[PDB]
Amino acid sequence: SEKAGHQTSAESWGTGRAVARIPRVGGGGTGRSGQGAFGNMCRGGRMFAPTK
């Protein structure tokens, strides 16, 4: 599905917070909040070169 892996509003924290620069989920009190988001290496992310 073309939506898969991209139904998220994540953004990168940037350098300076002792964490890598992959985008991350916002908010709090959820468990998903703060996770790696879009990248192909990220759990729940989008696969490299989605099959068309």
Binding site: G16, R17, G28, G29, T30, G31, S33, G34
Partner: peptide
Amino acid sequence: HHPRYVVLASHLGRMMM
């Protein structure tokens, strides 16, 4: 769950120049 934030900020000053 436990949110996290920018722990301290500031208090580092500036160096050399």
